């Protein structure tokens, strides 16, 4: 029945209140990304054969990703 009454815990509240989480966010550019200290280390062909363009990578690599659900974003 309401905007704020659909993405919160309760839904039977027909009063239009604004929780402190509802704050406007602008598409900004002041941000920093982190470069991993270990990439996948993939070699493609190193022979460049005539039977196709090869790529091969057997060494695995995993990382732990935090997930913000309210923003639906992984970091």
């Amino acid at each position: 029945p309401l905007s704020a009454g659909l993405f919160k815990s309760e839904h039977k509240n027909p009063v239009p209140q604004c929780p402190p989480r509802l704050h406007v966010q602008f598409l900004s550019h002041v941000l920093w990304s982190r470069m991993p200290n270990q990439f996948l280390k993939v070699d493609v062909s190193r022979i460049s054969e005539r039977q196709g363009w090869l790529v091969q990578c057997l060494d695995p690599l995993q990382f732990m990703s935090l997930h913000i659900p309210e923003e639906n974003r992984s970091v």
Partner: protein, 565 residues
């Protein structure tokens, strides 16, 4: 056998390409034609392939679509933004009238081109005859201008007029200032004597460009030809052939006399005491700055603009702070520069290939009497088409100019007492959504509270578009999902109803006036309702609900769509 799935109605704009994504434990083989690969099946009727899509005279190589995705040592070519590379029309000729005082000159140039073209055939020794063919070595245009009809005269003068018109249109007006044959004597004048000026050389070059442009625009209707590719990408042999062939005309004519990216170390490695030194190698010589920035620097402003960064540039040979002052000299392609910071006596120095830089006052140190604050981080900034390599130490065998300068004075590298390499924090390109800060200009958002509102407020001199968005989105899974935009008068607007399990986040893209009070209000009539209440000058502002979409530009159409079948 094909699949039953297609991505119709998608954004046709953009440079598409084959791309594979693999995690680990994988052995994939792309298959093209020719020497690149080996076809195992047959292509669909008419569909070409990438071994033909590759540009002529170019080696086709596989490489990471994303970035310099090489698990290597510190010797990684860090590059900033890139140019378009022109990876994707003739000049207008007929827009000016034809003066009659040079119509005689134009006819004489037409007969010049005609005699040029028939002596082109006489070099091989063609014969006069009534039948038209190429392999038979015969040409019916051996007859002179008194007997040949006007239609063929017009079709031959087509070329001559086109060329002479483009010759006027380059910006310079053009006014007035044996051997055996069957009866034709082609010899207007001497040609090898006179020397053509480079101005008219470039003129005839741009003219050949124009001619091949119209020829290609006419030939694209008649598939994937090296001649079909524009003249600027043609082979140099045929280039020079056409260039000289069309320069003969002007030789005869003159004869008689008619987004930067900022990289840095991690902010936790801030230093406040001691002698620190780090190298920066620049492969190119474009716009590049290097120095030491405090742990508050902005990743979009130029390095060294505000007091939050102490930088130096080689493109202008000057140090970068609040203000600008000439300092040191510029570098070349493939140079190194070692930056030194002594925190105990608060000195900053730069050594270009061992030679320590010097300003006008004779002071070797760049900056003096700077507070320690909360530290200094090695930082660099690369503009368009730049290639750099940072070295915070940890490899003295590769620290070339470190044992030359600084080692004996008492300077040590940044990360030499270190077991694991630095994180190398860069400036990201995706413009994520950030909450409105309090210490920000031209963006002020209030909070009032009957109904609750979130009013806006701004003050500045430069206008632009913002992409405001709510914090928490609304999801629906897995029932009916329809988004209807209803105005105050009626619901006569665009209604989108396609969402299986998406999280549509409320948003408004607004243009910023001198006074903008447009806001969002959670209202209620029968269901969830948000009213984006605008004010005066509401004609280019949009208000809708969007999933994760992070693109900074200025448009309303082509918002990257798709429909699966």
């Amino acid at each position: 056998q094909p699949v039953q799935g297609m991505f119709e109605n998608f954004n046709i704009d953009g440079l598409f390409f084959p791309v594979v994504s693999f995690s680990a434990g994988i052995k994939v083989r792309f298959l093209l034609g020719g020497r690149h690969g080996e076809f195992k099946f047959l292509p669909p009727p008419g569909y070409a392939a990438c071994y033909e899509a590759v540009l002529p005279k170019e080696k086709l190589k596989v490489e990471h679509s994303r970035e310099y995705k090489q698990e290597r040592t510190y010797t990684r070519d860090l590059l900033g933004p890139t140019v378009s590379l022109t990876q994707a029309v003739p000049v207008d000729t007929s827009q000016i009238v034809l003066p009659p005082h040079l119509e005689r000159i134009r006819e004489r140039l037409a007969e010049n081109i005609h005699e040029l073209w028939v002596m082109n055939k006489i070099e091989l020794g063609w014969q006069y005859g009534p039948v038209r063919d190429d392999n038979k070595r015969q040409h019916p245009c051996l007859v002179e201008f008194c007997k040949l009809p006007e239609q063929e005269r017009n079709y031959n003068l087509q070329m001559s007029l086109e060329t002479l018109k483009t010759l006027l249109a380059l910006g310079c007006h053009v006014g007035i200032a044996y051997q055996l044959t069957s009866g034709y004597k082609p010899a207007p004048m001497d040609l090898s004597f006179i020397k053509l000026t480079p101005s008219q050389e470039a003129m005839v070059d741009k003219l050949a460009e124009n001619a091949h442009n119209v020829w290609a625009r006419d030939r694209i209707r008649q598939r994937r030809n090296p001649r079909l590719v524009p003249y600027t990408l043609l082979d140099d042999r045929t280039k020079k052939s056409n260039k000289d062939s069309l320069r003969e005309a002007v030789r005869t004519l003159l004869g008689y006399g008619y987004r930067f990216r900022i990289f840095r170390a991690e902010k936790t490695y801030a230093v406040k005491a001691g002698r620190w030194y780090f190298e920066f190698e620049a492969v190119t010589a474009g716009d590049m700055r290097v120095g030491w920035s405090r742990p508050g620097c902005q990743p979009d402003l130029e390095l060294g603009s505000d007091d939050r960064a102490f930088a130096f540039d080689g493109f202008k040979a000057q140090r970068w702070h609040q203000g600008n002052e000439h300092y040191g000299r510029s570098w070349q392609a493939g140079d190194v520069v070692g930056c030194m910071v002594d925190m105990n006596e608060h000195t900053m120095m730069f050594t270009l290939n061992g030679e320590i830089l010097l300003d006008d006052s004779g002071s070797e140190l760049a900056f003096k009497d700077f507070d320690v604050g909360d530290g200094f981080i090695p930082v660099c900034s690369l503009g368009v088409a730049q290639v750099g390599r940072m070295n915070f130490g940890k490899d003295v065998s590769t620290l070339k100019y470190f044992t030359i300068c600084g080692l004996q004075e008492g300077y040590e590298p940044f990360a030499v007492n270190t077991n694991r390499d630095i994180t190398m924090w860069l400036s990201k390109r995706l413009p994520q959504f950030l909450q409105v800060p309090s210490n920000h200009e031209h963006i002020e958002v209030t909070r009032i509270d009957k109904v609750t509102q979130k009013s806006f407020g701004s003050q500045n001199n430069n206008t632009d578009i913002m992409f405001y968005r709510l914090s928490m989105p609304i999801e629906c899974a897995x029932x009916x999902x329809x988004x209807x935009x209803x105005x105050x008068x009626x619901x006569x607007x665009x209604x989108x109803x396609x969402x299986x399990x998406x999280x549509x986040x409320d948003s408004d893209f607004e243009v910023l006036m001198k006074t903008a009070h447009g806001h969002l209000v959670p209202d209620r009539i029968d269901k969830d309702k948000e009213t984006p209440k605008p004010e005066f000058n509401n004609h280019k502002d949009y208000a809708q609900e969007k999933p994760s979409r992070l693109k900074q530009x200025x448009x309303x159409x082509x918002x990257x769509x798709x429909x699966x079948x």
